[PDB]
């Protein structure tokens, strides 16, 4: 009906072009490597790990997810899979290594969001 599907796409594309950071894809087997990927890293602090509320020790880990552009993944030949690692090569991100765990359902035209886990 409307052109909103394209407006939304261009919006997401500009959001990425402005807020993305470079990354490196290293697959689980480390057989293939793809550098200079652009991803957006969303990290929120979490304290987790206690079974039920048994009184076990928690660890501090993030609730975090990485936004990709699908066009770029297809262009660069990247087939994201569980266990694959994203390294943040930007200066000052300490080469944080993020292990892809599971993918969020693709809603919308430009981006795909993976829930990941900090590994270092």
């Amino acid at each position: 009906a409307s052109n909103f599907a394209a407006i939304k796409a261009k919006a997401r594309r500009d959001v990425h072009a402005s807020l993305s950071v470079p990354a490196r894809y290293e697959n689980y087997s480390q057989d293939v490597i793809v550098e200079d990927l652009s991803v957006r890293w969303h990290n929120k602090i979490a304290i987790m790990g206690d079974l039920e509320n048994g009184g076990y020790a928690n660890i501090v880990e993030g609730i975090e997810r990485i936004i990709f552009t699908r066009e770029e993944l297809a262009v660069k030949g990247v087939v994201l899979s569980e266990g694959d690692s994203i390294i943040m090569t930007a200066e000052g991100y300490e080469n944080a290594r993020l292990v892809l765990k599971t993918q969020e359902p693709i809603v919308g035209p430009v981006e795909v969001v993976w829930q990941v886990a900090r590994a270092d």
Partner: protein
């Protein structure tokens, strides 16, 4: 580890639910484990069975003082997903559940004369003593809405544990 070998054996046992083996569903490479969350990378490939462990830290029945050998009652939360029929929202899960139960039974299923039907499978090769399948639950998600059908099947594995060689 003992527990891990048992889990791998159950997995590879269910990963033989395949159309080439006389089952209506193909689970090869899709009996997952240790995942608390399954996203589009998985749901885009149903049917999928996942075997997690129950969050309860039970105490076993010890065979000795010095409390070294015990019979565990290790509960495993077998569950599975398969794309439903929107007009029969949960019929598919009963069929997959049936295949999974039928496969698991192979481990304990004796013939009518008391002899094992599948002696090499029987008890996973002496790894387990018991396999108590609970009454399975097929339900829609209690809150939220899905075209993915859920079945929930607790499995109590009985196994002898000697913590000297766990």
């Amino acid at each position: 580890s003992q527990r891990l070998d048992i889990l791998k054996a159950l997995t590879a046992h269910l990963e033989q639910i395949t159309i080439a083996n006389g089952y209506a569903y193909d689970l090869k490479g899709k009996v997952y484990r240790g995942r608390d969350r399954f996203g589009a990378d998985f749901t885009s490939r149903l049917p999928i069975v996942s075997i997690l462990e129950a969050k309860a830290t039970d105490y076993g029945s010890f065979a000795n003082e010095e409390q070294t050998v015990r019979m565990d009652d290790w509960v495993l939360l077998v569950q599975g997903w398969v794309k439903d029929d929107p007009r029969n929202p949960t019929d598919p899960a009963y069929e997959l559940l049936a295949e999974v139960e039928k496969r698991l039974a192979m481990l304990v299923a004796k013939d009518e004369q008391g002899q094992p039907m599948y002696p090499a499978l029987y008890r996973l090769g002496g790894k387990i003593a018991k396999l108590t399948l609970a009454q399975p639950v097929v339900r829609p998600p209690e809150d939220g809405l899905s075209d993915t059908a859920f079945f929930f099947l607790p499995v109590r594995v009985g196994l002898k544990v000697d913590i000297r060689n766990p």
